[PDB]
Every structure is written in structure tokens, then in C-alpha cells.
Symmetry: C3
Subunit: 317 residues, 3 copies
Amino acid sequence: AKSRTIGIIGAPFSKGQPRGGVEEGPTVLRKAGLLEKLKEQECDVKDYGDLPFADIPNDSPFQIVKNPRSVGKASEQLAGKVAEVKKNGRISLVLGGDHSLAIGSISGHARVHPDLGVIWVDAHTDINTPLTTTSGNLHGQPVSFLLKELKGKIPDVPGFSWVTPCISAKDIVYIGLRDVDPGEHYILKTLGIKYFSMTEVDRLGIGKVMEETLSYLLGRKKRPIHLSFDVDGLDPSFTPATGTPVVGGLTYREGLYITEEIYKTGLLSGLDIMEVNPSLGKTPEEVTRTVNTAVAITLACFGLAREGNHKPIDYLN
Amino acid sequence: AKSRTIGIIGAPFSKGQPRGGVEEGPTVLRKAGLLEKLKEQECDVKDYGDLPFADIPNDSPFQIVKNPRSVGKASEQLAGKVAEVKKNGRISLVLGGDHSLAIGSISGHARVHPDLGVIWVDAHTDINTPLTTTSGNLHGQPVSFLLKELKGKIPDVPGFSWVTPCISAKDIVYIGLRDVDPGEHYILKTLGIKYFSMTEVDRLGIGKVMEETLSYLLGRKKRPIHLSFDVDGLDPSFTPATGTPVVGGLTYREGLYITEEIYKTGLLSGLDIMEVNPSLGKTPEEVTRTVNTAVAITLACFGLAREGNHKPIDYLN
Amino acid sequence: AKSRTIGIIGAPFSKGQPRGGVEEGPTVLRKAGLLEKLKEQECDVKDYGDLPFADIPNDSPFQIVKNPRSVGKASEQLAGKVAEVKKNGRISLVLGGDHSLAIGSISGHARVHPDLGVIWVDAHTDINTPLTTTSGNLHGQPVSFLLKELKGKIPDVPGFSWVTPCISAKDIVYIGLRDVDPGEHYILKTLGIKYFSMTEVDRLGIGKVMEETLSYLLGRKKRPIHLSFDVDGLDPSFTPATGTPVVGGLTYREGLYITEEIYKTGLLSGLDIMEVNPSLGKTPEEVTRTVNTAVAITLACFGLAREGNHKPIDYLN
Ligand SMILES: CC(C)[C@H](N)C(=O)N[C@H]1CN[C@H](C(=O)O)[C@@H]1CCC[B-](O)(O)O
Ligand SMILES: CC(C)[C@H](N)C(=O)N[C@H]1CN[C@H](C(=O)O)[C@@H]1CCC[B-](O)(O)O
Ligand SMILES: CC(C)[C@H](N)C(=O)N[C@H]1CN[C@H](C(=O)O)[C@@H]1CCC[B-](O)(O)O
Ligand SMILES: [Mn+2]
Ligand SMILES: [Mn+2]
Ligand SMILES: [Mn+2]
Ligand SMILES: [Mn+2]
Ligand SMILES: [Mn+2]
Ligand SMILES: [Mn+2]
């Protein structure tokens, strides 16, 4: 089935943030047996390999923005590979890597499927501009590089001249927000972006959260879905090996319920598993708890259900 | 008082699964002060003691099925004992022991109350037939031998000639499911059994789940309730000392909610507190934590309310 | 803004309970920088200092009730200070210290706003009378002294002659109950007090709980809200450094949600952050976790939101 036809793309990229380790994410995600687990799940899996991200020397900053040419080049590379995978009729599966790679993942996917809607699972909005940022870390800026309404609010940053915003403020729903900067909050409310912060999840329950997300995005017509999943969207008790953890997050059950309901539409076309840093777990156990949760989240996207699954045969015969 | 009249049966049996220790379940639950705690709770308790399950040497496998004569005879003796407690006008309380004992518990309970309904709290369906099973472990097969619709699918297993299925597929509700075999999922779906996996609990909340379960079983007519509670039904962060643990389980509150709501019906008639294994704790605290959650679930079954309880006396005078 | 205009009162008092260390609650909340964090949240903050409690010699018990003159004078002192804060148009924020201080907190607030409505977030009802108590601890008795309907059921207790019951049994809503003494449960039933125990929280979800809480208190017209927050209302996984912890409490998320909802009304006029004991944490991290949780609870009451916040300026210019 098309909802089970996958194309793996590794992205060993870390320069979108200061913490070293997130680049090892795809290697650690593969050592868990991801291809194998999906193969047994009736999935047509193809490994497109790990992208060759060349070391760019003398990458001087753009104002407060760090490693611009490196982040722009990586996403540009990913945009071509994601675009190739989509023309091959496969669901793109990006294994990050920092959340800056989403500029490339969504842009590549939008070239083949421009009518796509985004579900951004994160504790963060990642909507800072090279002008609103306080840190200068580009992994907290990808949404601003992708929005059409934010054209002219983004300057000529070195390495991102290839960029052309491919989504409108209406084509994106946030889930799990609990750490939004003032600049980001001003962008969120003025653009009238649809979001479900932790407050909304507590009020409604993940069931109604999903009901409204899928209705708002897929109501009028059936359209491709791109799920960009920051592991920090879930509570640190489930994913501690991550760069920017925030308490009071989405539970393991909620994360599985989000990814189950998205499979159940059969409209998933793109997937991002981002911010898994194996060098940041306090114990080796906290590391495997993050990797196992990330694996479990991905499997649910492609059909693995808690009620169970079976093949189309008579088990009683 | 009918809902607070109890007959305790210790069922120290382990041969339905491969790990030693579960037979100590009746010991550790008693040492916790369960009996005394039930009497403090205005309960009329009788302890029928522990069943002696005389050694069955010469108990070779039936295909891949391990210890069939031992599992068969322990359930048969438990069936006689449960029926006896039921004649004496008491709610039967089986302290296990592995979940294969449920064949005895439900058969014995049904011998006296053939109109009973089953609420099965577990991560697993335990509905593999001796032919769909890959493990050969009988603790994952109790429901198959009890379901009337599966007659002609259960072969002639030594030790089980006494079994006559007593529950129709329409008379059972599963709660807590998250690890179901392909063969089991096919059975579940083809026979149209009412279930609420972890997906449904996430979707509706435990509030609607219990309202639906009690309306589903008692809507047509008020009948006796048999609750078979597997401790692995609750999350291993609450019940870690258990042989088959699965992450993303029922919370402490959710578990007390299910039992508090079953209590209020006033119709509880049979109770099974299965799979506590005090030798499967990684630390001594994990053991106490398991036994304590088990005892707290039990006390809610017989009247303990979180809002409080009071005697019909004037506390102000 | 009126809802971000605060009067800080420290109450370093522990004689309402037997466990030493709760008097250091004002010290640790201040050290965690609560006042500095409030001013960064656009709050008008005046510091009224930490109340000096004169050590009373020959404090003979009244029956089983320990230190009545000490508890009685400390509430008498706080009642004065709160009235003073209320008179100068500020929201009184009391940093405790044991929960007996709510006698003085609420009495003081009702002297200036006699139409106040009380939300009591706690694992306990604290409604024991000096005669229904078996512990003799006054931190488990403040609601009995404040309720009008119990006048005649409270005898002449030394240190409390200045007390005049100021609220009706219908002017209070409990959230989080799971540990209620029989006499307290009796009073709860006979006086028809509105409550959401953990049972109602599990049944309805914190959304419906907050809808019904504000609707019940504010339905007829806007009235001022007094929130009495005992850290033990939350689960000991989030607030361990406390005197009377109980399993199955409100989550970190549900706590934030209650407070975010109260702030949104713009009617918070009285607040008590109670029962933090920095000497009761097993590790130094248990102490910081409690304190950080208490800090976050106080921040939500004065505007801090999980969807984000911002100054009324243009961030894109
Ligand atoms: C908790 C604080 C100290 C921390 N700086 C933190 O989380 N902050 C977030 C929110 N805005 C920051 C930025 O713009 O640099 C951070 C972005 C995170 C990017 B993401 O892909 O991991 O979602
Ligand atoms: C997760 C996998 C590895 C594990 N073997 C596991 O839990 N599997 C379940 C599902 N079916 C298996 C069987 O037939 O043996 C197991 C039975 C569990 C029985 B019960 O009474 O404890 O519910
Ligand atoms: C769990 C049991 C053993 C324990 N004695 C416990 O918590 N019990 C509660 C209920 N009534 C007791 C009393 O009257 O002393 C306790 C009051 C707690 C006051 B509070 O401010 O912290 O809410
Ligand atoms: Mn992100
Ligand atoms: Mn994030
Ligand atoms: Mn079981
Ligand atoms: Mn089980
Ligand atoms: Mn309390
Ligand atoms: Mn209290």
C-alpha cells in the first residue's frame, strides 16, 4: 500500500544548533532496527542513504545567526533528495538531525506536492526569524523561512538564496507547544496560525485535538500530509536525549495516538524525526528510552496499532 | 453487605508461563495487609486459604503448549473452589498466580451465575488458541477456552476435557490493550468483541470508556460482574514486577477509576488479581510498588472511594 | 493590569503541623527568584516582607489540638496583613508555611471583599473540626473555622476568639481530593459542598472541571476569587518535598491548566502557595522540582501561558 511505501533519507546534520551529538541521530535510529521493524510491518522500504554534508570552512555568522551557509546547503541538499523520493512515489522519511533540515524536507516535498498541509509536533513554534532570534540557532527558525506571509520579514541570509516560501499560515497546525518566545507568540497570533498548545490538549484531550487538526487541514479536500516531529514535543520522561527539553509535555500514549490517527487518514506523504541527540542522555538508559520512543512513534505513522494488526488471511483456518 | 462480602482464594500457580515467582503472588499480597485493610473498610471477609496444586510430574507438551495437565487441573480445582465460595453467598477473590487460572475462575463463577459478564483489564487479549499461539504459554490463552464462538477451534488438549465454554463473545469487554498478536487481532475483529485498547482510552478518556463498558454489559439486563484484572494492564511505572510488561499503560488514577466505577454498580461477583511476580523487581522498591498498586486496585473494588467514606453515624455529635 | 498587581506576604510558620521545615517555604520560593520572575511578566510587585511570629511559651493544647495560641496568633497576624494588602488594591500572595494560615488569609481577604469565592486545590478537605480531629494538627482544620454553617460546631479554642466565619458552604469548590477523613466526608455530604475529587477529575477531564468550577462560582455575576493552593494537591512525582503526600494526584499539566484558567477570568484577588517543605526531599533535586513546580503554579496565576506571552509592541518592526 501507498501509506506503507517508504523512502528513508538520513540527515547527519547538527550545525543548526550548538549541542554536538544530534548528527549521530540517524546512525543510532538505524542501530535500533528501524528498516527491519518496518519491513515486518508490511512496508516497502528503500534506503536512499545518508546525505553527504560537506564541511564548509570560514562560515562567518549573519548578524547573530550561526553557521548560515552550512544550514542553507544541508536543507538545499535534502530538498533535492526528498523531491526525488516523492517523484519515485514513496513517503519521504527524514531521520535528523536538528529541526533546521525541515526547510529542505518540506520544500522538496512541496515541489512534487504543493497542496500539502503541515502538522508540526513540538514544544516550540520554530517561527523565529533571523531578526527576532535571541540565540541565533537556525533550528528554531525553519517555519519563518517556509511561510509566504513572512516574505520580506526574512533578509538575504548567506546559503538560503535558493529558498522560496512554499506554505501559507493556514496550511500548518501546531501540537504540543509550551515554550514560545515573545517574537514567536506575536507571529503566531497576528498570522492567525492554528495551534494546540499543552493548554488545549489539557482542555480537549488528544482525541478532540486530533479530530480538529485533521478536520481543519483535510475538511474541504483530501490533501498530502507532512508530519514534522520534534522529539521534544513529548515530555522529557520519554525523550530526555534531546537538545531543548521542556517539562509538562505530550505523553507516550498521546504521541502514539497522534501518529495512529495520521496513518488512519492514509494521507501521510512526508515524515521528519528530529532532534534525537544520543550524547545528551544522563544514563545510557535515558538514551535508549529516547531512541525506542522515536522508533515507536515512526512505526505508528505506517500502520502499527495498539489494538493489534494482522495480514489478510483466515487465522482460524 | 453483598458488595462487601468476600471469599479469598489463594491460587499459587505458575506453570501457565515460563518465569518462576508468580506463585508467590498470594503470599506477598497477604503480607501487605490486604485482609486487614478490607476489614477496616467495613468488609465481611473469609479466607479459604491457598490451593495445594500437587505436583504433576509426566506433563509433556501438547504440540508447543507447555504444562497442559498442570494448567488444566489447577483451573479445574480453582473452578470447584470458586463455585463453592459462590454458593456460600460471597464475592470470590482469586489472588494469583498466572492469568491461565481465569479458565477455572470464570468456569466456577459461571457454574453458579451462568448470566455473568466479563471486564478483562489487560495489555493483552489472552485469546490465542493452542494453534494460533507461538509461545505455547497458557496464560495467553484463557479467553479462547471460555468463548462459545471458538468451539471447534480449541483441540483436545490433555487436562482440559472438563472445559465447556461459558461466555459468548458479546458478554466480554477488554480494557487496556496495547500488545495483541496477529492471530488474536483477527479473532478480536472477526468475532466482533467489545474492546477499548489504549487508543480508545486516549480518544474518549477513562470516563466515557467505563460509562460505555457498564452500559454495554448491563444495558439489556442487570447481571453479575466478573472482573479479571491483570496487573500488566496498568503501566509498568506502577506495576513493574510482572512477567509481560508493556509501556504506555493505564495510569494509577485510571485503574482506581475502573474499579471505583465497577464497585458502584453493586454487581461485582468475581475478582481475579493476577500476574504479580515479586521476583521480577529490578529493586526491592519495584516489588513493594507493585503489591501496593495491586492492593489499592483491590480496595477500590470493595468500596474505597477517593472522595472519602463515612459510617451512618453523626460525626458532629 | 489589576490581575498583575501583587502584594507579597511571607509566612514562615510550621506549628499547624508536626514536621519541621515548612517555615523555610518563603525562603526557598524567594531564593528561586519568584519576585524577579513576576516583574519580568509585567507585574507591579510590592514586598510586604516575611511576618515575624512570636514564639508563645506555655502553649497548652486544647484537648488533642497542638499549639492553639501559636496557630491562632499567626493567622490573626496574617489576617491583618492581607486586609492591608487588599485595601491598597493588590492581590495578596502568601508564601507559606503550613495550610492552617488559610484561616487568616481568607478572613483577611473577606474583610475587604466579603463576596469572595474560594477554590481549594488540595489532596485534602482540611475541614476537620477541633473535635472531629484524631491528629490534633490545625493545618487539617482551617475550613471548619471559616464556614458559617459550622458556627456552634466549633468550641472556644484559645487563640481563635477574633475569628468570625466568613464563607458559606456554597462559596467553596475543592479540586484534587483523594484522602478524606470520615468526619470530613460526613460534613462534605450534609452541607452539600461542591467538590471535584480525583474521581471527578478522571471522569470529566480538567477542562470540564474548570468549566463547572468558574460557572458554579461566577454564574450569577462576577465576584473576586481566592485560590488556596496546597502543593500536595499535585502528585508526589512533581511536588515530593511536602508533609502529607498522596499518590494519584493532579499532574503538572492539570495544575498549570487550573491556574491559567483562573488568571484568564481576571478575578484572582487572593492566593496561598502552601505546604512546600524543603527539608522533606530525599535528594536535593526533589526539593528543586517541588519549588520549580510551586514557582510555575504562581507564574500561571499572574499571566504566564504555555502558548506564549509578549509585550504590546510590534516584533516584526
Ligand atoms: C528552554 C530554553 C533555555 C531553550 N533555549 C528553548 O527550548 N528555547 C527554544 C524556543 N526558541 C529558542 C530559539 O529560537 O533558539 C529555542 C528553539 C528550539 C528549536 B527546536 O527545533 O528544538 O524546537
Ligand atoms: C511483548 C511480548 C514480547 C510478550 N511475549 C507478550 O507480552 N506477549 C503476550 C501476547 N501473547 C503472548 C502469548 O501468547 O504468550 C503473551 C501473553 C501474555 C499473557 B498475560 O496473561 O500476561 O497477559
Ligand atoms: C495520609 C494520611 C496518613 C495523612 N494523615 C493525611 O494526609 N491526612 C489528612 C486528612 N486529615 C489529616 C488531619 O486532619 O491531620 C490530614 C490533613 C492534611 C492537611 B493539608 O494542609 O496538608 O492538606
Ligand atoms: Mn523544533
Ligand atoms: Mn523543540
Ligand atoms: Mn493476562
Ligand atoms: Mn497481560
Ligand atoms: Mn493537603
Ligand atoms: Mn491543605
